[PDB]
Amino acid sequence: LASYFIGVDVGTGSARAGVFDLQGRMVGQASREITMFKPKADFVEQSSENIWQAVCNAVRDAVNQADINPIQVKGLGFDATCSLVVLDKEGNPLTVSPSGRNEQNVIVWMDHRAITQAERINATKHPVLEFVGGVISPEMQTPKLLWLKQHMPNTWSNVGHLFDLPDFLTWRATKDETRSLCSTVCKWTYLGHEDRWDPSYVGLADLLDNNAAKIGATVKPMGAPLGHGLSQRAASEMGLIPGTAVSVSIIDAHAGTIGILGASGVENANFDRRIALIGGTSTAHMAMSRSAHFISGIWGPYYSAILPEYWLNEGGQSATGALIDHIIQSHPCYPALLEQAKNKGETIYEALNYILRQMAGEPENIAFLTNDIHMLPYFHGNRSPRANPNLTGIITGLKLSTTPEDMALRYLATIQALALGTRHIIETMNQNGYNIDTMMASGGGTKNPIFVQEHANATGCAMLLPEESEAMLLGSAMMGTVAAGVFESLPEAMAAMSRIGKTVTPQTNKIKAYYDRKYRVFHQMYHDHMRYQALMQ
């Protein structure tokens, strides 16, 4: 009878579940919001218990909407943000917060409390650092563990488990404490090529104690089955069958890569020329090679972090969809425009795109609208390729005017700034072993025609959109098929369960030259920022 597979994806704001058939088509889906806590600037927290319930509720819902018998679900995969879950000796939520509330036991990925620690770690120039592009980010795990040790010794003395969020999800579902290569290698300095933690690697030697206690010391590749399927409790909690295969966990951006990067063309995907652009709240820029490439300001090279025998170079932008939405929803004209959008059966993006079109006189003139309006998009710092979490945003060409036209121009400027940041990342990869001329893109941005076309225009790269845009849900379900033994490797699941839905190419030379000039201003703004800093010193 028909088999189905479930992908679960816990993002920044919400946990999603998706039910997929063997073709990779989505037959059921659901979402559940998750609580966020912001004690003070730079602090961002969540709750593991709250996350797990959102997951279980979302899954029961997606199954019920697919209208299938739970006996039909053969596998699950779990993916999550690279956030830090903290549990005590008995395994319950243990506080990580200035609030002191144990409910707040998750340090979200975007949290920047540990900038100072990252600086300290970086000062050591220890060997494991070359695999994070030479500069460790406060957003990664070990700087946050160094932060916990120093500020909250109370919590530190009572810790039993330290889980990357996806490994937490997987543990709660199977009891297996086995950790993934993805999360450990990318965010914990585990050596994928030497298959071991580096003892020499900072003031966290105690984590190495009891061999395999707090941080885990059994590590496997994605697609390998965990424990013996869903525990009876977890199964009960999600409305599924005990023993259902569960894959080793994976980080969200990385799930999205499995979900789209392997799509055949129309002819094997060619990684030398194809980058994964995994969008959402933030964006990951994923490229893989058989050879190691060390690249300043880009994480990796990470051996076997996604695909066996591939080195992953991972860049990113910390605020992409989050920046666009901030710029949109921050504007005084937002509520009124949204109201007319609904009246016309439109999204706010469609309403803004309409304004752009009208202002431009012709669609091909839209990009020029921001000739005198520029943005440096480093609102939450820059991850790649500058690797500096202290950078901030700049907008120019501001006027007293508060109209839907102003709002639309600033929205466009935001889109182009993000596209130019993407160009910077791509150019950096092409300077370090790649020949990227194509982006496989996922995320909600890909439903916005102007987002997509200007990314193609600014970068000079074709934009390929998947048939199924929910790339992270799909990727995690694909892992499920591999743990259930329905496909023998990720590569073949990727091939059978994902395909191209749309190809959008760069437009004219005039438009390209415009972006070349915008790109000069983009780079100049960074140097101007550094000069202001110098002058103030």
TrEMBL record:
<keyword id="KW-0418">Kinase</keyword>
<feature type="domain" description="Carbohydrate kinase FGGY C-terminal">
    <location>
        <begin position="277"/>
        <end position="484"/>
    </location>
</feature>
<dbReference type="InterPro" id="IPR018485">
    <property type="entry name" value="FGGY_C"/>
</dbReference>
<dbReference type="Pfam" id="PF02782">
    <property type="entry name" value="FGGY_C"/>
</dbReference>
<dbReference type="InterPro" id="IPR043129">
    <property type="entry name" value="ATPase_NBD"/>
</dbReference>
<dbReference type="GO" id="GO:0005737">
    <property type="term" value="C:cytoplasm"/>
</dbReference>
<comment type="similarity">
    <text>Belongs to the FGGY kinase family.</text>
</comment>
<keyword id="KW-0808">Transferase</keyword>
<dbReference type="GO" id="GO:0019150">
    <property type="term" value="F:D-ribulokinase activity"/>
</dbReference>
<feature type="domain" description="Carbohydrate kinase FGGY N-terminal">
    <location>
        <begin position="4"/>
        <end position="259"/>
    </location>
</feature>
<dbReference type="GO" id="GO:0019321">
    <property type="term" value="P:pentose metabolic process"/>
</dbReference>
<dbReference type="InterPro" id="IPR018484">
    <property type="entry name" value="FGGY_N"/>
</dbReference>
<dbReference type="Pfam" id="PF00370">
    <property type="entry name" value="FGGY_N"/>
</dbReference>
<dbReference type="InterPro" id="IPR006003">
    <property type="entry name" value="FGGY_RbtK-like"/>
</dbReference>
<dbReference type="InterPro" id="IPR000577">
    <property type="entry name" value="Carb_kinase_FGGY"/>
</dbReference>
<protein>
    <submittedName>
        <fullName>Putative carbohydrate kinase</fullName>
    </submittedName>
</protein>
